[PDB]
Amino acid sequence: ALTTTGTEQHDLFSGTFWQNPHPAYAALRAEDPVRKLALPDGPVWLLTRYADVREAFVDPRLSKDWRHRLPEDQRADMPATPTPMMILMDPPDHTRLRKLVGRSFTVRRMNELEPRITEIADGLLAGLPTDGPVDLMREYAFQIPVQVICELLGLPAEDRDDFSAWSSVLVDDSPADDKNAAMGKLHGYLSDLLERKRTEPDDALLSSLLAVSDMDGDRLSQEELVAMAMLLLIAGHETTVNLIGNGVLALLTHPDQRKLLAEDPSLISSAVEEFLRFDSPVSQAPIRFTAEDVTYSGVTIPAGEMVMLGLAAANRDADWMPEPDRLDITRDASGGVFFGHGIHFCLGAQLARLEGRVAIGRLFADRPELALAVGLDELVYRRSTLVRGLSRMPVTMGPRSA
Numbered sequence: 420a421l422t423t424t425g426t427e428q429h430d431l432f433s434g435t436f437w438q439n440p441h442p443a444y445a446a447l448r449a450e451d452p453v454r455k456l457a458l459p460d461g462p463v464w465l466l467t468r469y470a471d472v473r474e475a476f477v478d479p480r481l482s483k484d485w486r487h488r489l490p491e492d493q494r495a496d497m498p499a500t501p502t503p504m505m506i507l508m509d510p511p512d513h514t515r516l517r518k519l520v521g522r523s524f525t526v527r528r529m530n531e532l533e534p535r536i537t538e539i540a541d542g543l544l545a546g547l548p549t550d551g552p553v554d555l556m557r558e559y560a561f562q563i564p565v566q567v568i569c570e571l572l573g574l575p576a577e578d579r580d581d582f583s584a585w586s587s588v589l590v591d592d593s594p595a596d597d598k599n600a601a602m603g604k605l606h607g608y609l610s611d612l613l614e615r616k617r618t619e620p621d622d623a624l625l626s627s628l629l630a631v632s633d634m635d636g637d638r639l640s641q642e643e644l645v646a647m648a649m650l651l652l653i654a655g656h657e658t659t660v661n662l663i664g665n666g667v668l669a670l671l672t673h674p675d676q677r678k679l680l681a682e683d684p685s686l687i688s689s690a691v692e693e694f695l696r697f698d699s700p701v702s703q704a705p706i707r708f709t710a711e712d713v714t715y716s717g718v719t720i721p722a723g724e725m726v727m728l729g730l731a732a733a734n735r736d737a738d739w740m741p742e743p744d745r746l747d748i749t750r751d752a753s754g755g756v757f758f759g760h761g762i763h764f765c766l767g768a769q770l771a772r773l774e775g776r777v778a779i780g781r782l783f784a785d786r787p788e789l790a791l792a793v794g795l796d797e798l799v800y801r802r803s804t805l806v807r808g809l810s811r812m813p814v815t816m817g818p819r820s821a
């Protein structure tokens with residue numbers, strides 16, 4: 420198994436790491452900031468220092484084109500992507516696709532979702548028991564973002580168990596063949612759904628994008644259109660959930676911060692920014708490929724290598740954030756790499772923040788006696804190189820507020 424080199428040995432992507440990766444991240448930052456991880460499916464490098472991570476995001480030698488892993492005499496005949504999602508592309512196709520979908524995620528559009536997000540959260544809360552067992556992950560944190568993405572896109576509620584199963588396999592330590600099969604089912608499902616939508620459109624996003632694609636296939640191809648639906652669905656199932664889970668947990672394990680929020684509920688948006696920093700939901704950005712040799716902190720990563728940008732690590736770098744290990748919901752937030760940086764910066768950043776403050780804010784308002792129903796040490800985390808997220812969170816809700 421892998422451990423940090425230097426003065427302190429901490430497990431890496433195994434052992435104690437899943438439970439609490441933060442000491443390992445700190446030892447990487449201090450003593451091995453540009454680290455090659457000899458992982459089972461092949462070596463992946465990891466950058467953990469804030470100044471390196473933030474700049475890496477705008478360094479074009481750090482490419483999304485997986486063909487950089489091939490020698491040139493092998494690249495000609497290969498597709499640009501395994502599936503034509505914009506997150507797996509460089510300009511110009513990235514630029515074109517992002518500009519197109521960005522038109523549907525304008526500031527005004529996402530905000531007008533607040534009354535509905537609030538109904539959804541309020542309905543979930545009303546349905547939770549006072550003292551019987553609750554998994555706050557499956558019953559609350561998971562539900563909000565998934566209902567929202569289904570409504571935004573126009574995804575049948577009756578198919579929710581099929582595509583949430585597919586989506587989670589793609590995001591965790593599943594075997595590469597399992598991921599391929601899940602992606603296959605998700606592509607076919609969404610392809611068939613789009614075919615049905617042509618015949619009966621609705622007013623939600625997938626119909627709108629299908630119409631753009633119908634009108635102008637060079638702006639958005641059919642395959643690009645399915646890939647976009649796939650990406651938006653997976654983001655709606657596997658990200659915000661862990662903002663909610665990690666942020667709730669931060670408050671449950673920090674009484675002082677929970678009390679400040681109780682006394683000023685308007686601290687919630689500042690609190691959300693602090694949760695995104697303190698326990699980043701996307702722990703490592705999806706992989707980049709070195710198109711040429713790059714040098715960061717005195718270490719050269721050769722051309723052709725796979726590279727993770729360590730967001731959870733960088734967001735606790737004391738060179739950037741004083742007392743990075745302290746949870747302080749009152750910080751005036753700025754910077755941060757939890758939503759990425761540059762051209763691929765999170766498309767759903769406004770949506771995620773809104774879902775987070777609504778879900779966490781309304782939860783603690785409604786159930787001011789919420790508590791964990793197990794010891795902190797008993798919490799099980801998912802094994803993922805992409806997310807920092809609880810598997811389940813046993814809680815006791817307590818009485819509704821009067």
Ligand code: HEM
Nearest residue numbers: 505506654658659662701704705758759763765766767771
């Ligand atoms: C707290 C929740 C979220 C976190 C922490 C997060 C994190 C990120 C990060 C770090 C990136 C950049 C990855 C990279 O450059 O390699 C990204 C991109 C992206 N995100 Fe988010 N995300 C969240 C929620 C959402 C939501 C709700 C959506 C729904 C629309 C979404 C959709 C996308 C898309 C489509 C991209 C690709 C953007 C592009 O390639 O231009 N995300 N996200």
Ligand SMILES: [Ca+2]
Nearest residue numbers: 545546547548
């Ligand atoms: Ca119930």
Ligand SMILES: [Ca+2]
Nearest residue numbers: 620621622626
């Ligand atoms: Ca219409």
Ligand SMILES: [Ca+2]
Nearest residue numbers: 737738739740
């Ligand atoms: Ca500094």
